[PDB]
Amino acid sequence: MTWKIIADSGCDYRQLPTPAINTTFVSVPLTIQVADQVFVDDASLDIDQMMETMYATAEASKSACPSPDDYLRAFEGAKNIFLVTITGTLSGSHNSAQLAKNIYLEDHPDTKIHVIDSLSAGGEVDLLVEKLNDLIDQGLSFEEVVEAITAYQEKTKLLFVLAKVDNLVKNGRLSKLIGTVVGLLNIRMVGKASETGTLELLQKARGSKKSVQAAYDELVKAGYAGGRIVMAQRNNEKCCQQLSERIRETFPQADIKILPTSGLCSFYAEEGGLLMGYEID
Numbered sequence: 001m002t003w004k005i006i007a008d009s010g011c012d013y014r015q016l017p018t019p020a021i022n023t024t025f026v027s028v029p030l031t032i033q034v035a036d037q038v039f040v041d042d043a044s045l046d047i048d049q050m051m052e053t054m055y056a057t058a059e060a061s062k063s064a065c066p067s068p069d070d071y072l073r074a075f076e077g078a079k080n081i082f083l084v085t086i087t088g089t090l091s092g093s094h095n096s097a098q099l100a101k102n103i104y105l106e107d108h109p110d111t112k113i114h115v116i117d118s119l120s121a122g123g124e125v126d127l128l129v130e131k132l133n134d135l136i137d138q139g140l141s142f143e144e145v146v147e148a149i150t151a152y153q154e155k156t157k158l159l160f161v162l163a164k165v166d167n168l169v170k171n172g173r174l175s176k177l178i179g180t181v182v183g184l185l186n187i188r189m190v191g192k193a194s195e196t197g198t199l200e201l202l203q204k205a206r207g208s209k210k211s212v213q214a215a216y217d218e219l220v221k222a223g224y225a226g227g228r229i230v231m232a233q234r235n236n237e238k239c240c241q242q243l244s245e246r247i248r249e250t251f252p253q254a255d256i257k258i259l260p261t262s263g264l265c266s267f268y269a270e271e272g273g274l275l276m277g278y279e280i281d
């Protein structure tokens, strides 16, 4: 009776804290191409060297999603499989995962697989993976877990704050329309994952302290009530500690984690970026 939780590198975990029994976690890396060099976003990756190279290269850098075959490899040795991808609207990760599922079940019929399009990235995907692990530790059946995680995904949201969005624009994942009005000269984009898995603007905040206030206000407005938060950040630990204190001051039971971004999430959120997943109602 074996379980695998699979996620692409839009999830910031390389290791899943305290995996449930008979459960293994696997991250499936996306890639980032900088000139004629390729960086694979696995735990071997020196994220700091990749970013330095990217910013040093006048030519735009590009991301790519996992092959279906990459997903097929990850399935091996498990009978109960959940696969969470980054938003299938901005990346083909989910499309490859959908195909891998259908291909594997031709080859290995006594297997159960549930593919979750997070419609998100970063901290919210992290929460979903943590919850899947929770649910398995709790002793649920495969179909019980599918039910509970579908419900939990209605309870989870994403807020981001980005000081730069150039790589998003350069890669066609954010319009020049929105892209020019933020991430330029003291203006950080405060946004959420939209109902379709896209970037949606919420506030422009001029400076840090205004960035924290906006993020706190948006959390309140969205219906946070003291549950779990996962803040995935790129060189933004100080803004994350000051936001965390404020949230804990208001909601004393808050369970907050701060994680470094993956290579993919670092690439797109960029320096100073934050992708905060959280629970509501």
Ligand SMILES: CCCCC/C=C\C/C=C\CCCCCCCC(=O)O
Binding pocket: 010, 030, 062, 063, 064, 065, 086, 087, 090, 091, 092, 093, 119, 120, 121, 122, 160, 162, 173, 192, 193, 194, 197, 198, 199, 264, 265, 268, 269, 275
């Ligand atoms: C909907 C989530 C929006 C999050 C916005 C904030 C920061 C962006 C950081 C990570 C998300 C990147 C999404 C695009 C991935 C493309 C991968 C590919 O090449 O296939």
Ligand code: NA
Binding pocket: 153, 154, 155, 156, 157
């Ligand atoms: Na959600």
